[PDB]
Motif scaffolding. Structure first.
Motif, PDB file in Angstrom:
ATOM      1  N   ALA A  21       0.996  -1.178  -0.027  1.00  0.00           N
ATOM      2  CA  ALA A  21      -0.025   0.066  -0.207  1.00  0.00           C
ATOM      3  C   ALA A  21       0.948   1.185  -0.008  1.00  0.00           C
ATOM      4  O   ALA A  21       0.794   1.985   0.915  1.00  0.00           O
ATOM      5  CB  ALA A  21      -1.030  -0.085   1.171  1.00  0.00           C
ATOM      6  N   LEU A  22       1.669   1.294  -1.055  1.00  0.00           N
ATOM      7  CA  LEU A  22       2.557   2.641  -1.243  1.00  0.00           C
ATOM      8  C   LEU A  22       2.716   2.856  -2.707  1.00  0.00           C
ATOM      9  O   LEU A  22       2.804   2.092  -3.487  1.00  0.00           O
ATOM     10  CB  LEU A  22       4.074   2.294  -0.887  1.00  0.00           C
ATOM     11  N   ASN A  48      -8.114  -5.968  -2.139  1.00  0.00           N
ATOM     12  CA  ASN A  48      -7.809  -4.887  -1.162  1.00  0.00           C
ATOM     13  C   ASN A  48      -8.324  -3.650  -2.199  1.00  0.00           C
ATOM     14  O   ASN A  48      -8.754  -3.935  -3.411  1.00  0.00           O
ATOM     15  CB  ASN A  48      -6.636  -4.712  -0.913  1.00  0.00           C
ATOM     16  N   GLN A  49      -8.286  -2.600  -1.584  1.00  0.00           N
ATOM     17  CA  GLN A  49      -8.345  -1.288  -2.203  1.00  0.00           C
ATOM     18  C   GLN A  49      -7.242  -1.070  -3.074  1.00  0.00           C
ATOM     19  O   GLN A  49      -7.500  -0.602  -4.119  1.00  0.00           O
ATOM     20  CB  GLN A  49      -8.378  -0.102  -1.270  1.00  0.00           C
ATOM     21  N   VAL A  50      -6.047  -1.578  -3.028  1.00  0.00           N
ATOM     22  CA  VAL A  50      -4.957  -1.430  -4.031  1.00  0.00           C
ATOM     23  C   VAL A  50      -4.994  -2.335  -5.350  1.00  0.00           C
ATOM     24  O   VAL A  50      -4.920  -1.560  -6.239  1.00  0.00           O
ATOM     25  CB  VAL A  50      -3.639  -1.951  -3.138  1.00  0.00           C
TER      26      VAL A  50
END
Lengths: 182, 281
Positions: free
Chosen positions: A47-48, A86-88
């Motif tokens: 998540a970056l 996930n949102q990613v």
């Protein structure tokens, strides 16, 4: 909609090289859609934004010269049971949707074992609960184990290991070079 | 190789928190038998290191073997009880583990390994909303734990709460100001967090990481992508704009030189042709 033995073998090898950590990459193809191979990006904390948005261009610069085009994106969650995107995953799939149609969001179910979500005007809905299409299952299952038993994942390298040392090739030449003869 | 080298390897793989469980257990299983007599009180730390690694490797045929030889030599030790709890948790027995850890916490209330394994289950059970809170409480009790301060940053980043993860990465950077990785990961958090109010910090930190470690390339890419993102911003003034277009060009004048030396190292492959076409944009 189909993956090549090279894409599947690279996927499982990267997933086995870092079992405790997550696995992500970009399935790139030639420009109905067949996934010839994947470029594995990172592991652990995904998540970056910056390192993920650098890989976009650093892979486009290779695919445009190698006559390739990025088609899909796969993710393997940390836990063994949870395989929901996930949102990613959505935020990366939406980015490739604007540059290449028919984007597939792949979820590597650790416990077949692969989900493919497609976006049709409402959400990302999987197809594995109904059925999953591949070119040939036994060939892939044999060639994957043929590289797994030899512990070849220790030799595999991804984009994260390439950002540490440039002497490492993110395109995995020594992997598909062995895949061709098997 | 000699056992005096295998011991050094098992010490190096323990100083740095590596998790190559396969290569660790492959050397530990030998030292358990082939060279048990060559080393004395060094066998207990090797037992602890091999048990936890075989657990990750999914081989309980060695986990219990290294656990009983530690339960015998150290009867009732709190570290071996923690090892037993971790084995319970690896064998999906999340029920006895909480009772064991509550029994441990009632004998020595200052124990922290039980406090951490009490949230390890919550991370494993998926109750991250509860794991983050139980870890914040522990941090409120035991400040300065530079491991929990990073696990909290990881949990917050996975929870997409980038705002509060910076508060943990700052607590980490104040105690290890000479560590470039803590600067790089804070720059990335600031990059992902917001815009001009945060890119101004991300650009500074991606450069501070380079100044602390000139061999870092992730910090170089982060500096380039943060300078370009402030150069291409509407609220950016002309001064900030030209300074950012200077920073980006200065970073690109070194990215290619790094890649040029890399392509020079490999006489067959040429990598300079890959990134340069990207830098001209």
């Amino acid at each position: 909609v189909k993956l090549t033995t090279q894409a599947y073998c690279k996927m499982v090898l990267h997933g086995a090289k870092y079992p405790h950590c997550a696995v992500n990459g970009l399935l790139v193809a030639e420009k109905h859609t067949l996934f010839v191979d994947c470029i594995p990006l990172f592991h652990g904390t995904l998540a970056l934004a910056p390192m993920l948005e650098v890989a976009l261009t650093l892979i486009d610069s290779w695919c445009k010269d190698h006559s390739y085009v990025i088609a899909g994106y796969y993710q393997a969650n940390e836990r063994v049971k949870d395989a929901s995107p996930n949102q990613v995953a959505e935020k990366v799939a939406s980015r490739i949707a604007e540059g290449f149609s028919d984007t597939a969001l792949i979820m590597v179910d650790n416990t077949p074992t692969i989900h493919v979500y497609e976006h049709h005007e409402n959400r990302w809905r999987c197809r594995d609960p109904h059925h999953d299409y591949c070119e040939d299952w036994p060939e892939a299952q044999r060639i994957s184990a043929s590289l797994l038993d030899s512990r070849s994942y220790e030799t595999l390298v991804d984009f994260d290991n390439h950002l540490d040392d440039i002497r490492n090739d993110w395109t995995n030449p020594e992997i598909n070079k062995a895949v061709l003869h098997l | 190789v000699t056992w005096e080298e295998m011991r050094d390897k098992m010490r190096k793989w323990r100083e740095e928190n590596s998790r190559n469980s396969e290569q660790i257990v492959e050397v530990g299983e030998e030292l358990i038998n082939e060279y048990a007599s060559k080393l004395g009180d060094d066998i207990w730390i090797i037992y602890e290191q091999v048990m936890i690694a075989a657990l990750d490797y999914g081989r309980d045929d060695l986990a219990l073997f290294c656990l009983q030889e530690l339960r015998r030599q150290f009867p009732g030790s709190h570290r071996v009880k923690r090892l037993t709890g971790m084995r319970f948790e690896a064998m999906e027995r999340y029920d006895d583990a909480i009772q064991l850890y509550d029994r441990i916490l009632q004998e020595d209330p200052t124990n922290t390994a039980a406090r951490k394994r009490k949230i390890a289950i919550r991370k494993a059970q998926g109750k991250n909303v509860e794991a983050i809170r139980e870890l914040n409480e522990y941090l409120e009790q035991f400040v300065g734990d530079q491991e929990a301060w990073h696990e909290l940053a990881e949990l917050y980043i996975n929870e997409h709460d980038y705002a509060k993860a910076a508060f943990c990465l700052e607590e980490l950077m104040m105690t290890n100001p000479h560590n470039h990785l803590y600067c790089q990961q804070y720059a990335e958090v600031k990059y992902t967090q917001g815009g001009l109010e945060n890119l101004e910090l991300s650009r500074k930190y991606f450069a501070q990481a380079l100044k602390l470690n000139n061999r870092n390339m992730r910090a170089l890419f982060g500096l380039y992508m943060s300078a370009s993102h402030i150069a291409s911003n509407p609220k950016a003034s002309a001064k900030t704009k030209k300074d950012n277009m200077k920073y980006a060009s200065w970073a690109a004048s070194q990215i290619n030189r790094a890649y040029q030396f890399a392509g020079r190292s490999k006489k067959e492959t040429k990598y300079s042709l890959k990134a340069v076409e990207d830098m001209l944009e």
